[PDB]
Nucleic acid binder design. Sequence first.
RNA 1: UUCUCCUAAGAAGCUAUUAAAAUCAC
RNA 2: AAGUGAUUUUAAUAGCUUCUUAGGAUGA
Lengths: 131, 512
Amino acid sequence: AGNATEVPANSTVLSFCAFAVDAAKAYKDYLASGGQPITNCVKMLCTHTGTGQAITVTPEANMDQESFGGASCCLYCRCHIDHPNPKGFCDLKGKYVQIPTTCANDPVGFTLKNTVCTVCGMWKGYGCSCD
Amino acid sequence: ENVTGLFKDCSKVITGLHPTQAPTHLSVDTKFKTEGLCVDIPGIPKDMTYRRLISMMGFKMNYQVNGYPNMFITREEAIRHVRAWIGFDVEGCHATREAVGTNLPLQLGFSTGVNLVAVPTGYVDTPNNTDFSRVSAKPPPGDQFKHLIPLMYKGLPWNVVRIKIVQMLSDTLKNLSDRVVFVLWAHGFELTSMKYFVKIGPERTCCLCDRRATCFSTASDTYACWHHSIGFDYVYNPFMIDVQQWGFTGNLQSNHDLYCQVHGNAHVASCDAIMTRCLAVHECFVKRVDWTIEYPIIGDELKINAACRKVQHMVVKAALLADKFPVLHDIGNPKAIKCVPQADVEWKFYDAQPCSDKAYKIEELFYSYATHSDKFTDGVCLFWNCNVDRYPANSIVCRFDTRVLSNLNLPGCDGGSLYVNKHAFHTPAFDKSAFVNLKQLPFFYYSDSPCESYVPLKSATCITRCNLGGAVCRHHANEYRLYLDAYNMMISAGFSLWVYKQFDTYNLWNTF
RNA sequence: UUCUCCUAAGAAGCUAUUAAAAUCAC
RNA sequence: AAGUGAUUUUAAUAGCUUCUUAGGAUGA
Ligand SMILES: [Ca+2]
Ligand SMILES: [Ca+2]
Ligand SMILES: [Zn+2]
Ligand SMILES: [Zn+2]
Ligand SMILES: [Zn+2]
Ligand SMILES: [Zn+2]
Ligand SMILES: [Zn+2]
């Protein structure tokens, strides 16, 4: 009884960021030890012709991004632990995220290490042209 | 099967979730999934109020990372940390209303005999963050676990029973070892129930100290050893062994009672934790003294062993030089180490089994009373640290009294206890029926060393020509007091000397 | 008549999926 | 109304091998 929501490939990296004091730094280091990054993420069938921003309520990406399901990428909403930012709310859960396809094999590692630029509205560094 | 029962949504809501606010792909309902990739439809919006209990059952700690020390250890490094075994059994309830298909821990019990009774809580999934709140439970249907029915009403919130644990481990394991090795049987629902009080991470060090860090604290993000862990929530990096993967078939109560018969309310949450390590202790230590595995020094290890060797070198020489025994038997010494080399008796080594040497012609023999009641009739048999059920009528026994509890004497199987002092001796239960043929030993000191030339001591227990006279010499007063210190320290350590019926302390006097 | 290949049929097996039946641990 | 798994048996289905049968065509 109960709908299942996890595949056995992640069963050994979610059960290791679950028990961890800081599961951000404890997942950066999991990849370095030859492990494989988190899969089974949500991938949206957008049109690849949209204003590519980090977080938006509707799938909007360029020809080189790929809009994912926001929650799917927040590692914390993916191993069901507490979010570290004040008040404990996820800035992703509920809003589509668009990852550069250069790294779209493991978005869950992208959002953990990159950062959204405030006024440029895009992924700081991967399009943040703040010259 | 392509799935797992881990984080399996346990709600009773029919439909799935929106593309966003969906953890994985298998969780987006069939209204959105089209051609292996989800699509957004503005016809239906995302949710704003909902809660979906999450089943944290089926954790797999088979990871490995370059710094992170692993939990599950294998016997040979579980047998080296035997001072830090804590049985662990958690008995749990179910989920009933608007949530079905999951267990969640209710009563926890460790081998310290400590039932803690948490409240049924579980990680629900608000549309913003994975919460941690009460969920309505239902005691397990049946009768063998009937005691769980009136217990679902008298619990504690977790953050008040996460600190009862660390204030309980850090009382037992405070002065035995520097880690915790949960000796758990199922391995199943005992990792669903460690998500709530265990963190892990790279091996860090006690703040304010230098021992290994084995506690955490979400208030002041800082670690501690067992000593400086006052008011600390989580255990740090606990190791844990799984006992039924050592190859046991059948439930616990019928896999334990094959050996021990004094562990008994076998379905509560803490007598199923004492059976969980009384069965790990037994079939890991019961039948050998590995010798090869040294142990760290907790305290008094040198002095207790030195006092034991002194008193053993003492009493056997006294008995031999008193009763003029022609031959002396020996049982249970691994090598051939003659305790009194300056003797006339023939040291026939009736060892239990040959141990790594044949240089001294040690014999192989096992001792039982009904078998060897009339085999040894000549001389005296030295049963130093022997484990026989009953001792013969001519012997010098030193048996460890297993009813004394200390940081050395860990609890063991079948009433017997594990005395881990530089080695692991599994002495069986200390019963009075074993000493029906013997008596206790009086305190005394006898030496043939000539007297040489401060508080005057007058005690008839000391046997020296100087104290026989009016004035006691300073070449025997300090010897008497040091021997008294050794004797009392050993007796407090827990050994118990026994001697044959005809032992007369006066027979030593006429030797002078 | 022989060889190869193709189409179909029948057989047995392998692995994959679905359903129920039983057992064990929890 | 529906506790968690693990391995078992059969049935239903798909994929593939071999064997047999029939058909077609090539070549001697
Ligand atoms: Ca269990
Ligand atoms: Ca139990
Ligand atoms: Zn999140
Ligand atoms: Zn910018
Ligand atoms: Zn410390
Ligand atoms: Zn027992
Ligand atoms: Zn003297």
